[PDB]
Amino acid sequence: GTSKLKYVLQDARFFLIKSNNHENVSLAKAKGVWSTLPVNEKKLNLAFRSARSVILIFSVRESGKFQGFARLSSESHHGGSPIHWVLPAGMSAKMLGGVFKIDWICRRELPFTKSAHLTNPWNEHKPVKIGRDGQEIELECGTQLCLLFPPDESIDLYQVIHKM
């Protein structure tokens, strides 16, 4: 059912994460971690203290899809492990320093064609698929977007609820 999901999303904050490649999203799904540029790391650390749940909604650039969504379980932390991210042009390992722990809520894909009816008030009411890495998605739009994903029956939200 969707009842536990709706409970997790209650009063949550939502941020769009844009990854340049699939490999880092695969690594994030396997290890339960994410790293972003310092401007967005600062925003997510602030949000983590401000809300019961902070939800990251992932999209790989050029894929035409979202790849899933996850809840922050911690603020960013340094010096825990050297995550072997694949670094784009101009990107360095010192910028992707700062690791957040995340619990995946859905590891399934959602094509952008399925979210064409959802617009984000915090990005000029453009379609929610449009936005830069770290763009905040308003509550109602973000909730409806997360509810569009196929259910991920491999995940038990019971342990997520206990982190809250």
UniProtKB/Swiss-Prot annotation:
Highest taxon in the source lineage: Eukaryota
Compartments, as annotated in UniProt: Nucleus; Nucleus speckle
Residues modified as Phosphoserine: 81, 92
Function: Regulator of alternative splicing that specifically recognizes and binds N6-methyladenosine (m6A)-containing RNAs. M6A is a modification present at internal sites of mRNAs and some non-coding RNAs and plays a role in the efficiency of mRNA splicing, processing and stability. Acts as a key regulator of exon-inclusion or exon-skipping during alternative splicing via interaction with mRNA splicing factors SRSF3 and SRSF10.
Protein name as it appears in the record: YTH domain-containing protein 1
Annotated signal sequence range: none
UniProt effect for mutating residue 133 to K: Does not affect ability to influence alternative splice site selection
Record text about domains: The YTH domain mediates RNA-binding.
Record annotation: effect of changing residue 44 to E: Does not affect ability to influence alternative splice site selection
Assembly and interaction partners: Interacts with SRSF1. Interacts with SRSF2. Interacts with SRSF3. Interacts with SRSF7. Interacts with SRSF10. Interacts with CPSF6. Interacts with KHDRBS1/SAM68. Interacts with TRA2B. Interacts with KHDRBS3. Interacts with EMD. Interacts with RBMX. Interacts with ZCCHC8.
Source organism per UniProt: Homo sapiens (Human)
Domain YTH: 12-149
PTM info: Tyrosine phosphorylated.
Residue positions binding RNA: 18-20, 34-35, 85, 133
